[PDB]
Amino acid sequence: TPDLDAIVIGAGFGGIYMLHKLRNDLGLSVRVFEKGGGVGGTWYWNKYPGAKSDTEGFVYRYSFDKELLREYDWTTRYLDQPDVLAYLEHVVERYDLARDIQLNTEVTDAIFDEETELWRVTTAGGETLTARFLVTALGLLSRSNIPDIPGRDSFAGRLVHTNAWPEDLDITGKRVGVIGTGSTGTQFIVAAAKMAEQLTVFQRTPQYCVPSGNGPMDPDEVARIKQNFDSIWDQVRSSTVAFGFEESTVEAMSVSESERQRVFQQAWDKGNGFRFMFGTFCDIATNPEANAAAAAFIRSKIAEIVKDPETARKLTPTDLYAKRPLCNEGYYETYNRDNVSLVSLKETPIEEIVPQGVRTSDGVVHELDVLVFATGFDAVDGNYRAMNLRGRDGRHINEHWTEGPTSYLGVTKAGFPNMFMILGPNGPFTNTPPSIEAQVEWISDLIDKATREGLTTVEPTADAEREWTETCAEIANMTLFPKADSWIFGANIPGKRHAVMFYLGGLGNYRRQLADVADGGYRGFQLRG
Template sequence: MPTMMSDSAIGTEIKYDAIVIGAGFGGLYMLKTLRDELKLKVRVFDKAKDVGGTWYWNRYPGALSDTEAFTYCFSWDQDLLQEWDITTRYLTQPQILKYINHVADRHNLRQDIQFETVITAAEFDEESSRWLISTNDGRKYSAKYLVTALGLLSATNVPNINGIDQFKGELYHTANWPRDANLNGKRVGVIGTGSTGTQVVTAIAPVVGSLTVFQRSPQYMVPVGNGPVSKEYVDNIKRNYDSIWEQVKNSKVAFGFEESQIPTMSVSEAEREKIFQNAWDKGGGFRFMFETFSDIAIDEKANIAAQDFIRKKISEIVKDPETARKLTPRDLYAKRPLCDSGYYATFNRENVALVDVKANPIKEITVSGIRTEDGVDHELDVLIFATGFDAVDGNYKRINIRGRNGIAIQEHWKEGPSSYLSVATANFPNMFMILGPNGPFTNLPPTIETEVEWVSEIIAYMEEEKLSSMEPNIEAETLWSGTCREIADKTLFSKADSWIFGANIPGKPHTVYFYLGGLGAFREVLHDVRKDNYRGFKFETQNSSDKKNTLTKQMQKEDA
């Protein structure tokens, strides 16, 4: 078992066994595993003032997880699963942050976390096989292992709109929401109608003076179905948690329900309508897409049936026919499934207006609001950007990360981010990624646990075998990217413009960013790679003369 390094520093360079970037779900579990199980000396850095990651920053009104509460948590603390009080079907941002804070306190994690610190550079030193880390306070650190737990959705995306700097009102991004924001009675504009935008629009409409929603793409949405849960509901979950987690970890989307095996067109139109209606009444975006029928995401006829059902609901809910028309999507139902708390009905309010910026683009942001191409000035006191994130690799590009031969991560990923098994990338030895590129498109906590545990196992293996470094073969990484592309191309997701393929960022490569084969299949791949002596990785060790010998474990099978 690995031993802890001493507290000594080399000059101003403070040494650790492992440095972790990020104190959200991934960073906290990585810290606990490396520190408590592997007995390594670990330091976590985060730019925030406290734990929480994405949920620390996203404090906007209406912020809600669309994963049901009983699976939006850690499975590894079985006592906490029994102790934690589940009160609602879904969790709001304050509820999630309370849970994460409790985990940090319960396991004494804060003592090894350095808050309000930004990692500005990380460079792999080939002579020592260590990562050299620089922070914004001028300090220097080094570690054998660098683990990036940066989050999929954390690098904010602010669109480059002419005149943005001259707006004299309040300007907010939902991912950096100010604690003292006051919208009561104000004229508010919201740009963006993805998951975040629809949540914030629904939440603030009752309190603002007027609300203008600037919509680029209408969305398919179903109700979330949130609300209090009964004691019987909670008791049943806690009594069956072992089987629940077994199902989650072997399922596709890991949301805690059995995915349908029934093709859409295998039942009558009346039966389809009944199944869709039951899902609509129960709520949940992923449930609607994956629990109703087996082929909505892969068969266009099935997809059209789901489209038609949601379109009909929009026309029933929204009273003004022109507004309903603008809110009705006409493309594939093949983006991230969304759910809402009354978004469509919000447009029945007299103080809410919708602007279709595809038909009538934003010309500029003015001193007092937004001017559209038709010459109309939309006067605003507050402008909210709900424009999402430079997802997956956005935060990596904001750090000066350099691997072998000084190669920058931006250069390595110039054609789009890539990885081997989501957790590592060629030319960046001993750097492990939690939720790196081409990982499972799922409920995130079970995937985070899967990757943290696998990374911990490979680090333990390296320590036991006295290996100095590891990294994937470029061939293995290329094969994994090909596998992810092949699977994505079998779905309808690849045929829609979506952030999950990089389409929301101008100039960003439109490529595959996720493994769409499901969590269960992903776990099988990880198991097989580990069983086959970490197939696809190459390792280096030190001999008695301190000269490096390379031990290469080449990819043996193309289906890795």
């Protein structure tokens, strides 16, 4: 007999919904452990100025409760971090979840006992307890990456990762430096430039940024959206990327030069990064000729916006437009400000961090009060590999993942009976909440099957997981995504295996894969009584 039916790790979008399904819908005994001082995952940690959704707010939310969709108001096209946090806090209150979420509690160990067929979980605080079912909602983008830059520990000012932004820190009138120009660094740069006396950007790799088109929402437009939510969510769940817009079915090079320009400009005017990549033409990320046309359009905008030609050059990427799409309000314009400087780490790498700032290879000491690491995450597997996470034969998860992280269907792991992952490796790459709903709902159904039928273990076969890896590889290799160095294939962390870590077939196809496996008697699972 376990202490609980189920333990859930993480209280972001993923663990919040998982706890709701298992406790409120299935009536099981459940606890969430969250290492943070508050619920909300991403939206708890990322307190930095300019932190916001790059999915439009109308579909950056749960869908599963039709009344919550009718009730809950948003006021801006994209959701600022405090607004997302307030929404998730509202969900926790609405479903009476806080009593079963244990905060400030890091899980250090999770060990499967093959004799008892129970999971034993150990906390940093030195408590252990057992559950039949373990759900890991640890976050794809949760484990902070802070590079080992020479002299980093000598800096005498405030040095923080974006994912550790402190509530107290006011950068107004300070000299601020930021390392990184992904989605986090770039939205930070736009907000920080308005506050800091001087902002120095340390850019290793420029990315292709498009407008967000952010601004206030017409309360009548919010009302109209709520009246059409059913069709909106149907289009989301059927789509590839689930961002709430109709994906193009047109091949970029099937139309005239004049029409490509018009389509690209219309998407640029409306905003959104996923709109620019998938709302224009159907083959931006698959056809190198289409990819070149999209990239060229973005480079031409950089040249128009940025007044200093050297600054324009350092901002202009020349690589494939196949990193996750970025958007911002006023990003390139920010470099026209007198108080903003751009260091290309390609031309002048960091030599040393010193007490007073950052010295680049040109010998310049960039004097800073604050140094911000917008350096991203040990993405997908980082919080798994950091855990003493052991399956059958007492093997650590690392023993299984020597060629990169693997799963069956993104949610289960061979060797790890009764363990379910929310956004485990080799799952969908979409607007996050609807992918979380597809996984939580499916995991809920399989756990309930196990309860109703008296199963002791649910586990995928080694063969099934290997076939899933090959399915993910084939789809990935039909795209340009593997030929862009980013966190998505593990290439951002020195020493990390370069490997497929997502199913890139989209939400519609992914939901079908889950449904087909469930309807076919859980094809690839051993169900033991």
